[PDB]
Design an enzyme around this catalytic site. Structure first.
Site, PDB file in Angstrom:
ATOM      1  N   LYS A  76     -18.202 -26.752 -56.663  1.00 41.76           N
ATOM      2  CA  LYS A  76     -18.803 -26.706 -55.337  1.00 41.76           C
ATOM      3  C   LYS A  76     -18.830 -25.291 -54.777  1.00 41.76           C
ATOM      4  N   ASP A  77     -17.869 -24.451 -55.168  1.00 41.45           N
ATOM      5  CA  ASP A  77     -17.915 -23.042 -54.793  1.00 41.45           C
ATOM      6  C   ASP A  77     -18.966 -22.288 -55.590  1.00 41.45           C
ATOM      7  N   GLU A  92     -23.552   0.588 -36.375  1.00 39.44           N
ATOM      8  CA  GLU A  92     -24.172  -0.478 -37.144  1.00 39.44           C
ATOM      9  C   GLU A  92     -24.208  -1.769 -36.326  1.00 39.44           C
ATOM     10  N   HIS A 145      -0.687 -21.822 -48.111  1.00 39.62           N
ATOM     11  CA  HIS A 145      -0.136 -22.735 -49.102  1.00 39.62           C
ATOM     12  C   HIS A 145       1.003 -23.592 -48.564  1.00 39.62           C
ATOM     13  N   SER A 177      -4.920 -26.799 -46.388  1.00 41.60           N
ATOM     14  CA  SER A 177      -6.105 -26.681 -45.556  1.00 41.60           C
ATOM     15  C   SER A 177      -6.179 -27.829 -44.555  1.00 41.60           C
TER      16      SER A 177
HETATM   17  C1  HEM Z   1     -14.090  -3.681 -48.223  1.00 37.15           C
HETATM   18  C2  HEM Z   1     -14.436  -2.581 -48.895  1.00 37.15           C
HETATM   19  C3  HEM Z   1     -15.500  -1.554 -48.431  1.00 37.15           C
HETATM   20  C4  HEM Z   1     -16.351  -1.583 -47.389  1.00 37.15           C
HETATM   21  C5  HEM Z   1     -16.535  -2.684 -46.321  1.00 37.15           C
HETATM   22  C6  HEM Z   1     -17.129  -0.362 -47.419  1.00 37.15           C
HETATM   23  C7  HEM Z   1     -18.115   0.002 -46.526  1.00 37.15           C
HETATM   24  C8  HEM Z   1     -18.955   1.089 -46.645  1.00 37.15           C
HETATM   25  C9  HEM Z   1     -20.124   1.356 -45.840  1.00 37.15           C
HETATM   26  C10 HEM Z   1     -20.653   0.481 -44.685  1.00 37.15           C
HETATM   27  C11 HEM Z   1     -20.671   2.496 -46.258  1.00 37.15           C
HETATM   28  C12 HEM Z   1     -21.946   3.128 -45.662  1.00 37.15           C
HETATM   29  C13 HEM Z   1     -23.038   3.115 -46.726  1.00 37.15           C
HETATM   30  C14 HEM Z   1     -24.406   3.302 -46.128  1.00 37.15           C
HETATM   31  O1  HEM Z   1     -24.585   3.052 -44.913  1.00 37.15           O
HETATM   32  O2  HEM Z   1     -25.327   3.694 -46.883  1.00 37.15           O
HETATM   33  C15 HEM Z   1     -19.873   3.003 -47.359  1.00 37.15           C
HETATM   34  C16 HEM Z   1     -20.097   4.165 -48.072  1.00 37.15           C
HETATM   35  C17 HEM Z   1     -19.402   4.623 -49.173  1.00 37.15           C
HETATM   36  N1  HEM Z   1     -18.304   3.974 -49.706  1.00 37.15           N
HETATM   37 FE1  HEM Z   1     -17.535   2.148 -49.135  1.00 37.15          FE
HETATM   38  N2  HEM Z   1     -16.709   0.389 -48.497  1.00 37.15           N
HETATM   39  C18 HEM Z   1     -15.713  -0.314 -49.139  1.00 37.15           C
HETATM   40  C19 HEM Z   1     -15.026   0.092 -50.261  1.00 37.15           C
HETATM   41  C20 HEM Z   1     -15.178   1.296 -50.906  1.00 37.15           C
HETATM   42  C21 HEM Z   1     -14.323   1.825 -51.945  1.00 37.15           C
HETATM   43  C22 HEM Z   1     -13.073   1.085 -52.478  1.00 37.15           C
HETATM   44  C23 HEM Z   1     -14.815   3.024 -52.306  1.00 37.15           C
HETATM   45  C24 HEM Z   1     -14.322   4.040 -53.364  1.00 37.15           C
HETATM   46  C25 HEM Z   1     -13.328   3.811 -54.220  1.00 37.15           C
HETATM   47  C26 HEM Z   1     -15.997   3.271 -51.515  1.00 37.15           C
HETATM   48  C27 HEM Z   1     -16.789   4.391 -51.596  1.00 37.15           C
HETATM   49  C28 HEM Z   1     -17.860   4.697 -50.792  1.00 37.15           C
HETATM   50  C29 HEM Z   1     -18.716   5.843 -50.939  1.00 37.15           C
HETATM   51  C30 HEM Z   1     -18.577   6.924 -52.031  1.00 37.15           C
HETATM   52  C31 HEM Z   1     -19.645   5.813 -49.987  1.00 37.15           C
HETATM   53  C32 HEM Z   1     -20.721   6.925 -49.866  1.00 37.15           C
HETATM   54  C33 HEM Z   1     -22.003   6.535 -49.143  1.00 37.15           C
HETATM   55  C34 HEM Z   1     -22.842   5.665 -50.033  1.00 37.15           C
HETATM   56  O3  HEM Z   1     -22.667   5.740 -51.271  1.00 37.15           O
HETATM   57  O4  HEM Z   1     -23.691   4.909 -49.502  1.00 37.15           O
HETATM   58  N3  HEM Z   1     -16.190   2.203 -50.670  1.00 37.15           N
HETATM   59  N4  HEM Z   1     -18.837   2.116 -47.563  1.00 37.15           N
HETATM   60  C1  HEM Z   2     -11.307 -10.681 -46.620  1.00 38.10           C
HETATM   61  C2  HEM Z   2     -11.031 -11.529 -45.625  1.00 38.10           C
HETATM   62  C3  HEM Z   2     -10.600 -13.009 -45.809  1.00 38.10           C
HETATM   63  C4  HEM Z   2     -10.429 -13.726 -46.935  1.00 38.10           C
HETATM   64  C5  HEM Z   2     -10.606 -13.290 -48.405  1.00 38.10           C
HETATM   65  C6  HEM Z   2     -10.023 -15.057 -46.556  1.00 38.10           C
HETATM   66  C7  HEM Z   2      -9.749 -16.092 -47.419  1.00 38.10           C
HETATM   67  C8  HEM Z   2      -9.529 -17.400 -47.061  1.00 38.10           C
HETATM   68  C9  HEM Z   2      -9.590 -18.544 -47.941  1.00 38.10           C
HETATM   69  C10 HEM Z   2      -9.914 -18.486 -49.445  1.00 38.10           C
HETATM   70  C11 HEM Z   2      -9.323 -19.636 -47.221  1.00 38.10           C
HETATM   71  C12 HEM Z   2      -9.273 -21.094 -47.729  1.00 38.10           C
HETATM   72  C13 HEM Z   2     -10.683 -21.610 -48.003  1.00 38.10           C
HETATM   73  C14 HEM Z   2     -11.454 -21.836 -46.727  1.00 38.10           C
HETATM   74  O1  HEM Z   2     -10.855 -22.290 -45.724  1.00 38.10           O
HETATM   75  O2  HEM Z   2     -12.683 -21.580 -46.716  1.00 38.10           O
HETATM   76  C15 HEM Z   2      -9.075 -19.223 -45.861  1.00 38.10           C
HETATM   77  C16 HEM Z   2      -8.761 -20.050 -44.809  1.00 38.10           C
HETATM   78  C17 HEM Z   2      -8.573 -19.645 -43.511  1.00 38.10           C
HETATM   79  N1  HEM Z   2      -8.815 -18.379 -43.023  1.00 38.10           N
HETATM   80 FE1  HEM Z   2      -9.375 -16.738 -44.095  1.00 38.10          FE
HETATM   81  N2  HEM Z   2      -9.961 -15.116 -45.184  1.00 38.10           N
HETATM   82  C18 HEM Z   2     -10.306 -13.878 -44.689  1.00 38.10           C
HETATM   83  C19 HEM Z   2     -10.364 -13.541 -43.354  1.00 38.10           C
HETATM   84  C20 HEM Z   2      -9.993 -14.353 -42.303  1.00 38.10           C
HETATM   85  C21 HEM Z   2     -10.143 -14.060 -40.895  1.00 38.10           C
HETATM   86  C22 HEM Z   2     -10.770 -12.751 -40.366  1.00 38.10           C
HETATM   87  C23 HEM Z   2      -9.669 -15.106 -40.197  1.00 38.10           C
HETATM   88  C24 HEM Z   2      -9.561 -15.330 -38.667  1.00 38.10           C
HETATM   89  C25 HEM Z   2      -9.661 -14.372 -37.741  1.00 38.10           C
HETATM   90  C26 HEM Z   2      -9.192 -16.084 -41.149  1.00 38.10           C
HETATM   91  C27 HEM Z   2      -8.616 -17.295 -40.838  1.00 38.10           C
HETATM   92  C28 HEM Z   2      -8.505 -18.377 -41.681  1.00 38.10           C
HETATM   93  C29 HEM Z   2      -8.052 -19.704 -41.324  1.00 38.10           C
HETATM   94  C30 HEM Z   2      -7.603 -20.145 -39.916  1.00 38.10           C
HETATM   95  C31 HEM Z   2      -8.091 -20.460 -42.423  1.00 38.10           C
HETATM   96  C32 HEM Z   2      -7.711 -21.950 -42.542  1.00 38.10           C
HETATM   97  C33 HEM Z   2      -8.850 -22.792 -41.983  1.00 38.10           C
HETATM   98  C34 HEM Z   2      -8.760 -24.208 -42.475  1.00 38.10           C
HETATM   99  O3  HEM Z   2      -8.347 -24.414 -43.640  1.00 38.10           O
HETATM  100  O4  HEM Z   2      -9.097 -25.129 -41.693  1.00 38.10           O
HETATM  101  N3  HEM Z   2      -9.409 -15.598 -42.419  1.00 38.10           N
HETATM  102  N4  HEM Z   2      -9.214 -17.852 -45.797  1.00 38.10           N
HETATM  103  C1  LIG Z   3     -12.221 -20.574 -55.735  1.00 33.05           C
HETATM  104  O1  LIG Z   3     -10.874 -20.122 -55.763  1.00 33.05           O
HETATM  105  C2  LIG Z   3     -10.710 -18.841 -55.337  1.00 33.05           C
HETATM  106  C3  LIG Z   3     -10.755 -17.804 -56.269  1.00 33.05           C
HETATM  107  O2  LIG Z   3     -10.957 -18.077 -57.581  1.00 33.05           O
HETATM  108  C4  LIG Z   3     -10.589 -16.480 -55.862  1.00 33.05           C
HETATM  109  C5  LIG Z   3     -10.643 -15.382 -56.888  1.00 33.05           C
HETATM  110  C6  LIG Z   3     -10.377 -16.207 -54.502  1.00 33.05           C
HETATM  111  C7  LIG Z   3     -10.199 -14.802 -53.971  1.00 33.05           C
HETATM  112  C8  LIG Z   3      -8.763 -14.432 -53.738  1.00 33.05           C
HETATM  113  C9  LIG Z   3      -8.236 -13.203 -53.733  1.00 33.05           C
HETATM  114  C10 LIG Z   3      -6.790 -12.885 -53.496  1.00 33.05           C
HETATM  115  C11 LIG Z   3      -9.127 -12.015 -53.988  1.00 33.05           C
HETATM  116  C12 LIG Z   3      -8.799 -11.346 -55.332  1.00 33.05           C
HETATM  117  C13 LIG Z   3      -9.159  -9.896 -55.350  1.00 33.05           C
HETATM  118  C14 LIG Z   3      -8.457  -8.865 -54.877  1.00 33.05           C
HETATM  119  C15 LIG Z   3      -7.120  -8.983 -54.206  1.00 33.05           C
HETATM  120  C16 LIG Z   3      -9.005  -7.466 -55.005  1.00 33.05           C
HETATM  121  C17 LIG Z   3      -9.857  -7.276 -56.270  1.00 33.05           C
HETATM  122  C18 LIG Z   3      -9.516  -6.010 -56.998  1.00 33.05           C
HETATM  123  C19 LIG Z   3     -10.341  -5.315 -57.788  1.00 33.05           C
HETATM  124  C20 LIG Z   3     -11.755  -5.743 -58.045  1.00 33.05           C
HETATM  125  C21 LIG Z   3      -9.911  -4.048 -58.483  1.00 33.05           C
HETATM  126  C22 LIG Z   3     -10.446  -3.951 -59.921  1.00 33.05           C
HETATM  127  C23 LIG Z   3     -11.042  -2.607 -60.197  1.00 33.05           C
HETATM  128  C24 LIG Z   3     -11.383  -2.087 -61.377  1.00 33.05           C
HETATM  129  C25 LIG Z   3     -11.223  -2.791 -62.693  1.00 33.05           C
HETATM  130  C26 LIG Z   3     -11.973  -0.703 -61.442  1.00 33.05           C
HETATM  131  C27 LIG Z   3     -13.273  -0.630 -62.253  1.00 33.05           C
HETATM  132  C28 LIG Z   3     -13.384   0.671 -62.978  1.00 33.05           C
HETATM  133  C29 LIG Z   3     -13.402   0.873 -64.297  1.00 33.05           C
HETATM  134  C30 LIG Z   3     -13.313  -0.228 -65.315  1.00 33.05           C
HETATM  135  C31 LIG Z   3     -13.520   2.274 -64.838  1.00 33.05           C
HETATM  136  C32 LIG Z   3     -14.089   2.370 -66.261  1.00 33.05           C
HETATM  137  C33 LIG Z   3     -13.032   2.739 -67.255  1.00 33.05           C
HETATM  138  C34 LIG Z   3     -12.951   3.846 -67.999  1.00 33.05           C
HETATM  139  C35 LIG Z   3     -11.854   4.139 -68.974  1.00 33.05           C
HETATM  140  C36 LIG Z   3     -13.989   4.923 -67.905  1.00 33.05           C
HETATM  141  C37 LIG Z   3     -10.335 -17.252 -53.579  1.00 33.05           C
HETATM  142  O3  LIG Z   3     -10.134 -17.036 -52.253  1.00 33.05           O
HETATM  143  C38 LIG Z   3     -10.501 -18.571 -53.993  1.00 33.05           C
HETATM  144  O4  LIG Z   3     -10.458 -19.590 -53.097  1.00 33.05           O
HETATM  145  C39 LIG Z   3      -9.184 -20.205 -52.989  1.00 33.05           C
END
Ligand code: HEM
Ligand code: HEM
Ligand SMILES: COc1c(O)c(C)c(C/C=C(/C)CC/C=C(\C)CC/C=C(\C)CC/C=C(\C)CC/C=C(\C)CCC=C(C)C)c(O)c1OC
Ligand SMILES: CCCCCCCCCCCCCCCCCC(=O)OC[C@H](COP(=O)([O-])OCC(O)COP(=O)([O-])OC[C@@H](COC(=O)CCCCCCCCCCCCCCCCC)OC(=O)CCCCCCCCCCCCCCCCC)OC(=O)CCCCCCCCCCCCCCCCC
Ligand SMILES: CCCCCCCCCCCCCCCCCC(=O)OC[C@H](COP(=O)([O-])OCC(O)COP(=O)([O-])OC[C@@H](COC(=O)CCCCCCCCCCCCCCCCC)OC(=O)CCCCCCCCCCCCCCCCC)OC(=O)CCCCCCCCCCCCCCCCC
Ligand SMILES: CCCCCCCCCCCCCCCCCC(=O)OC[C@H](COP(=O)([O-])OCC(O)COP(=O)([O-])OC[C@@H](COC(=O)CCCCCCCCCCCCCCCCC)OC(=O)CCCCCCCCCCCCCCCCC)OC(=O)CCCCCCCCCCCCCCCCC
Ligand SMILES: CCCCCCCCCCCCCCCC(=O)OC[C@H](COP(=O)(O)OCCN)OC(=O)CCCCCCCCCCCCCCC
Ligand SMILES: CCCCCCCCCCCCCCCC(=O)OC[C@H](COP(=O)(O)OCCN)OC(=O)CCCCCCCCCCCCCCC
Ligand SMILES: CCCCCCCCCCCCCCCC(=O)OC[C@H](COP(=O)(O)OCCN)OC(=O)CCCCCCCCCCCCCCC
Ligand code: HEC
Lengths: 93, 75, 57, 247, 385
Positions: E228-229, E272, E202, E206
């Site tokens: 567009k998104d 993987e 910010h 960009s």
């Molecule tokens: C960026 C977020 C996450 C990534 C990239 C990720 C990645 C993965 C991957 C690659 C597996 C292997 C599944 C397979 O090969 O079948 C896995 C399994 C699993 N993950 Fe995640 N995970 C994320 C977030 C979470 C969170 C927040 C939870 C729980 C709160 C969770 C719960 C589990 C569980 C219970 C499994 C059991 C294996 C299955 O259900 O397939 N994960 N996760």
């Molecule tokens: C969960 C992971 C990430 C999220 C949610 C995220 C999110 C974003 C968003 C929303 C933007 C602005 C929109 C866009 O440029 O498309 C952005 C820009 C950017 N991100 Fe990420 N990003 C992630 C990971 C990364 C990684 C892994 C890198 C580099 C190693 C990176 C580098 C950049 C750069 C350099 C920009 C600015 C590029 C430009 O505006 O020309 N980000 N990121």
């Molecule tokens: C187009 O504009 C956007 C934009 O709109 C967004 C969102 C993003 C994304 C930006 C972020 C910072 C990502 C936001 C998200 C996170 C930081 C993490 C998200 C967190 C969660 C999903 C946690 C929420 C989890 C729950 C509610 C748990 C669910 C479980 C429940 C409800 C249990 C059931 C309840 C009972 C009582 C049984 C952009 O990058 C972006 O481009 C600029």
């Protein structure tokens, strides 16, 4: 809140570019236009122009790394065959 | 009455021109081994030739010919 | 008329939003029924219901 | 490595459940269970499959009740604490032929027959590998190979030598529906049944994927029109430059 | 003023997704950032609902995943969404990082934004590794053995770190319950570091495909890039739904349906697919200590980029040689993954050693030398001296 440092972007009204003088812009409402104008024409002629300008920067590196891969796969298959037992002992050992 | 459809189909394509070539090549390998197993020294010479490769070449050919057609004779 | 069509459904957002919800309720039930019917007909003779009645003869 | 230790690649057959709109043939599932019970169940287990999951798929509710009631399951101890046994019920699981792994290896020359609840998903080739392995036993090993005693030859097994012998022979099972039971027919039916054991959601997953793709494809097309409508003013925009006078 | 600008909470929403001034020239490659935000939400929600039916004991871990598929209603949808969603997470992230490498988004004004992204990349690799181990199949148990055994090459303290990580003498019950607890926590650290990612963006905004200033022509974010998104959001779920309902096991390994057994080696052991390029770099060095160090270097050399680019123009849009050698690096990356899924054979050993050299020579040799040559060609091609 305290002030911040000096950046290279502002907000509306003080964006931070050069002073503009002499440029005029015109636009028409989207409700009075045809959104899909020229899609068929662009899908063929514009698409051909874009492809013809960039396809040489992608295909040549791809073809170099694909010829390398296939040549290495055939050599390995020949090495572990009956006709390659004289070479497998003289390389891997 | 009804015999193995896969066995009946495999014996068909083994008699074609391409099949008879792969069959004839496998028998040439068998004779080279059937006579090399009856010599002094074959009990211990480290490298003992087999005929798995020739068997694989022939077996692959019957699989491409029979796979697209077998399941239409079943139920 | 096109003026009466706009005045009834597109002038007030409440009617516009209510129409979308009432059109999603009807679409939901009709879309499901038409999909199972086509899916079952494409696989006639392979379902348990088909084979169960055949052995019941 | 060599092609012998890789194992021969299985060909591709025209299964009836192949295809985005195709389901399982439930008559082959019903026939495949009979092959398992009469041939496979002597040495392999299906411990991840419950009796209740067969109702409405390949058997009636009453049929499965009579099938499970032929096995004995442990019950709660009596008033004096002595152990008891009871006949099976719909909520149980299909029992295996051996009490433990040492018993299994003792009856199979030291080799362990694997469980067959996910075997289709756990092998590279799926249904084509199971069918090719069950029908790919040559009467003779190729000239040159030396099999260890107690092992058989199969080109589809990685390495060549497999501890399981041929078990499928023509007219060894009498189907109730009159289908001629041959080696290929039985190998085809038991493979369909084992595939249903690994993926019991196959039929309902493909029906849900049809609705999802149809709805999601319409939204992708509708959003393209909406984006182009909102960008119409910016896409067709004109600029003119008239240099200012020096002051 | 408007309530959207005066309110304490709405003003953060308005300043980031409503009134944000965006350049009018950014193409669809600038849409991957919003997609990564949707991927992170998908993984968190499906993981939490799956965690209500999961047990982390080493004797019940494999059977609890099978319980989710069979007994839980719509449980196979959650599992295939979570497993395939993680594969699509790395697809977008790889393209997100290559966009900024092509357009010079790492250069001077935005070095801090680039550095935070490298930290997010490291955490995401760790999160995916920890969740793969929680299934406890044959490839997850033996994959965890090789990975955690590389820390024993550290001098003096190496052997003690492995015992502290294992919780015992090998990969056992203490390890598996350890990894599920960390797999729950690390995604929340990523969500907090994503907010720091947006804060550093910010300050200067960009960039644009042309590589020049965008302060002369801006349009608001709302109703221009919100819609567009939405175009790529719908396309994203269409391809994901294809892999979830019609081919859910194409991106996996069949050996992970065999329950984990510490007594039988599962022939070839590979991670993987998205970790395969970094697995081949580790195996190319015939030394445990040196080979392990080189594996984290491959992620840390990305920080050297803002200083080995000697070009006065930002991006590769108008550069002939830089465009050609950019795709050499891209396809070099793909070949590295192929070697990582191969055996240790005669040709493949040398193929991965040369391809490893090209990976490092790109940042340290090719980019500095090429960028200086093009500077002169731009000069002498128009000056009349
Ligand atoms: C960026 C977020 C996450 C990534 C990239 C990720 C990645 C993965 C991957 C690659 C597996 C292997 C599944 C397979 O090969 O079948 C896995 C399994 C699993 N993950 Fe995640 N995970 C994320 C977030 C979470 C969170 C927040 C939870 C729980 C709160 C969770 C719960 C589990 C569980 C219970 C499994 C059991 C294996 C299955 O259900 O397939 N994960 N996760
Ligand atoms: C969960 C992971 C990430 C999220 C949610 C995220 C999110 C974003 C968003 C929303 C933007 C602005 C929109 C866009 O440029 O498309 C952005 C820009 C950017 N991100 Fe990420 N990003 C992630 C990971 C990364 C990684 C892994 C890198 C580099 C190693 C990176 C580098 C950049 C750069 C350099 C920009 C600015 C590029 C430009 O505006 O020309 N980000 N990121
Ligand atoms: C187009 O504009 C956007 C934009 O709109 C967004 C969102 C993003 C994304 C930006 C972020 C910072 C990502 C936001 C998200 C996170 C930081 C993490 C998200 C967190 C969660 C999903 C946690 C929420 C989890 C729950 C509610 C748990 C669910 C479980 C429940 C409800 C249990 C059931 C309840 C009972 C009582 C049984 C952009 O990058 C972006 O481009 C600029
Ligand atoms: C030698 C090789 C040379 C090659 C020659 C031929 C190659 C073929 C390529 C053709 C290119 C092409 O098609 O597009 C170019 C052409 C013009 O391109 P351009 O102006 O040169 O540049 C394009 C810009 O990059 C961006 O343009 P834009 O942002 O203005 O438009 C959005 C963009 C969409 O762009 C994206 O989303 C980017 C990513 C798309 C690629 C991957 C998509 C894969 C598709 C699956 O449009 C497309 O490109 C459409 C992609 C395909 C649409 C079909 C599905 O675009 C079109 O013609 C698209 C028209 C789409 C019609 C929209 C339909 C709306 C009507 C509503 C119907 C209602 C739905 C039913 C619901 C039911 C209700 C009851
Ligand atoms: C987003 C999170 C929070 C929502 C706030 C929206 C942001 C905003 O700009 O609001 C201020 C915005 C006006 O702010 P502004 O024009 O920027 O400047 C401040 C004005 O001086 C403000 O002065 P004003 O005279 O314009 O404000 C009078 C206005 C607002 O005065 C107030 O402060 C009243 C309290 C407002 C919030 C209530 C809590 O009085 C009303 O509440 C009249 C409108 C009531 C009709 C409600 C129509 C929507 C019904 C929702 C049902 C739809 C769901 C469908 C089914 C669901 C699915 C199962 O207020 C509205 O537009 C009212 C929203 C309707 C309330 C519900
Ligand atoms: C195959 C390519 C054939 C198309 C062709 O002849 O144009 C080559 C054309 C020539 O390049 P250019 O338009 O001079 O420069 C590329 C612009 O930066 C790209 O500018 P753009 O935003 O107008 O291009 C968006 C592009 C592709 O949009 C993307 O970059 C999006 C990539 C797909 C991710 C979205 C869903 C994620 C799913 C997860 C997997 O979509 C199209 O090509 C649709 C119009 C036809 O290259 C492309 O449009 C790239 C297509 C490769 C995919
Ligand atoms: C230190 C390293 C030194 C050695 C470097 C080795 C690599 C050398 C550089 C190789 C880069 C590729 C050359 C670019 C050629 C190119 O792509 O031209 C792109 C050209 C033209 O495109 P256009 O229509 O836009 O222009 C012309 C405007 N009317 O397409 C084509 O003719 C298509 C037809 C080809 C058949
Ligand atoms: C495993 C656990 C995850 C990691 C730990 C997470 C927390 C550690 C903090 C992240 C590391 C710092 C980023 C690298 C910076 C860099 O390298 O860039 C270099 C920049 C250069 O600054 P400059 O361009 O202004 O001047 C150019 C002059 N060189 O130096 C910094 O910015 C210093 C920033 C340190 C601030 C400490 C962090 C305090 C966080 C509070 C804010 C909370 C936000 C709200 C909650 C989201
Ligand atoms: C976005 C794409 C980013 C680039 C991905 C890095 C290289 C992928 C690893 C390739 C590999 O290692 O192999 C290829 C792998 C598994 O195929 P395989 O290894 O079994 O056989 C290899 C036979 N030569 O295909 C995949 O997983 C598909 C991954 C999706 C990529 C699109
Ligand atoms: C009746 C049909 C039948 C089917 C279908 C079947 N079994 Fe096996 N099976 C084994 C043994 C032992 C192995 C392990 C082979 C090895 O590890 O070398 C095995 C392995 C397998 C495998 C694994 C193949 C692989 O690639 O690992 C499958 C699948 C299989 N059997 C299915 C003992 C048996 C016995 C006892 C003679 C019978 C009967 C038997 N198996 C009958 C059957």
């Amino acid at each position: 809140g305290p002030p911040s440092g000096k950046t290279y972007m502002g907000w509306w009204g003080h964006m931070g570019g050069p002073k503009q003088k002499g440029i005029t812009s015109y636009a028409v409402s989207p409700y009075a236009q045809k959104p899909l104008q020229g899609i068929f024409h662009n899908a063929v002629f514009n698409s051909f122009r874009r492809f013809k300008s960039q396809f040489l920067y992608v295909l040549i590196p791809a073809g170099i790394y694909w010829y390398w891969w296939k040549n290495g796969n055939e050599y390995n298959e020949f090495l572990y065959s009956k006709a390659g037992r004289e070479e497998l002992e003289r390389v891997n050992v | 009455e009804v015999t193995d459809q896969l066995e009946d189909l495999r014996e068909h394509f083994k008699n074609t021109e391409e099949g008879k070539a792969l069959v004839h090549h496998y028998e040439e390998c068998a004779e080279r081994v059937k006579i090399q197993q009856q010599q002094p020294g074959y009990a211990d010479l480290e490298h003992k030739e087999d005929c798995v490769e020739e068997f694989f070449h022939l077996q692959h050919y019957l699989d491409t010919a029979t796979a697209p057609r077998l399941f239409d004779k079943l139920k | 008329s096109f003026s009466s069509l706009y005045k009834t459904f597109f002038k007030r957002n409440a009617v516009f939003v209510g129409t979308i919800f009432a059109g999603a309720f009807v679409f939901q039930t009709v879309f499901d029924t038409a999909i199972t019917s086509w899916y079952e007909n494409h696989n006639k003779g392979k379902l348990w219901k088909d084979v169960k009645a055949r052995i019941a003869a | 490595m060599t092609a012998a230790e890789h194992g021969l690649h299985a060909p591709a057959y025209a299964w009836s459940h192949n295809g985005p709109f195709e389901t399982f043939d439930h008559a082959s599932i019903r026939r495949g269970y009979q092959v398992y019970r009469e041939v496979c169940a002597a040495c392999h287990s299906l411990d991840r499959v419950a009796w209740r999951t067969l109702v409405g798929v390949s058997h009636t509710n009453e049929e499965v009740r009579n099938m499970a009631e032929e096995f004995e399951y442990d019950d709660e101890p009596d008033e004096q604490g002595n152990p008891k046994k009871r006949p099976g019920k719909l909520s149980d699981y299909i029992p295996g032929p051996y009490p433990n792994e040492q018993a299994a290896r003792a009856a199979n020359q030291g080799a362990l027959p694997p469980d067959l609840s996910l075997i289709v998903k756990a092998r590279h080739g799926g249904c084509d590998y199971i069918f090719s392995l069950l029908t790919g036993y040559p009467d003779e090993p190729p000239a040159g190979v030396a099999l260890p005693p107690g092992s058989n030859y199969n080109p589809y097994f990685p390495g060549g030598s497999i501890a399981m012998a041929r078990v499928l022979f023509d007219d060894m099972v009498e189907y109730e529906d009159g289908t001629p039971a041959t080696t290929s027919q039985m190998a085809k039916d038991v493979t369909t049944f084992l595939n249903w054991c690994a993926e019991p959601e196959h039929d309902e997953r493909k029906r849900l994927g049809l609705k999802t793709v149809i709805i999601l494809s319409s939204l992708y097309l509708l959003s393209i029109w909406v984006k182009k409508f909102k960008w119409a003013g910016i896409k067709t925009r004109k600029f003119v430059f008239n240099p200012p006078k020096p002051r | 003023m408007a309530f959207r600008k005066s309110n304490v909470y709405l003003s953060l929403v308005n300043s980031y997704i409503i009134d944000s001034p965006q350049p009018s020239s950014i193409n669809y490659w600038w849409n991957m950032g919003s997609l990564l935000g949707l991927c992170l939400v998908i993984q968190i929600v499906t993981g939490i609902f799956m965690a209500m039916h999961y047990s982390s004991n080493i004797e019940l871990a494999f059977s609890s995943v099978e319980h989710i598929m069979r007994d839980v209603h719509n449980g196979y949808i959650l599992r295939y969404l979570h497993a395939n969603g993680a594969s699509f997470f790395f697809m977008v992230m790889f393209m997100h990082m290559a966009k900024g490498l092509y357009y010079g988004s790492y250069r001077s004004p935005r070095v801090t934004l680039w550095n935070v992204g490298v930290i997010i990349f490291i955490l995401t690799i760790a999160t995916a590794f920890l969740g793969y181990c929680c299934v406890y199949g044959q490839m997850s148990h033996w994959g965890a053995t090789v990975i955690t055994n590389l820390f024993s090459a550290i001098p003096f303290v190496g052997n003690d770190i492995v015992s502290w990580l294992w919780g015992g003498f090998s990969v056992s019950n203490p390890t598996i319950q350890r990894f599920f607890a960390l797999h729950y926590l690390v995604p929340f650290i990523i969500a907090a570091m994503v907010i720091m990612h947006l804060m550093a963006l910010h300050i200067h905004g960009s960039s644009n495909p042309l590589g020049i200033t965008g302060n002369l022509d801006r349009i608001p974010m709302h109703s221009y890039f919100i819609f567009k998104d939405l175009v790529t959001v719908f396309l994203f779920m269409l391809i994901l739904a294809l892999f979830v309902f019609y081919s859910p096991n194409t991106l996996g390994h069949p050996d992970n349906y065999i329950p984990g057994n510490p007594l039988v080696t599962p022939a070839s052991i590979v991670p993987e697919w998205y970790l395969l390029p970094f697995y081949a770099i580790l195996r190319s060095i015939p030394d445990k200590l040196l080979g392990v160090i080189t594996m984290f270097a491959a992620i840390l050399v990305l920080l050297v980029l803002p200083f080995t680019d000697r070009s006065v123009v930002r991006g590769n849009t108008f550069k002939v040689l830089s465009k050609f050698f950019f795709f050499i690096f891209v396809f070099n990356f793909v070949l590295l993954g192929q070697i990582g899924a191969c055996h240790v054979e005669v040709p493949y050993v040398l193929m991965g050693q040369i391809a490893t050299f090209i990976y490092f020579a790109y940042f340290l040799i090719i980019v500095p030398v090429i960028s200086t040559i093009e500077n002169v060609l731009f000069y002498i091609g128009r000056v009349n001296k």
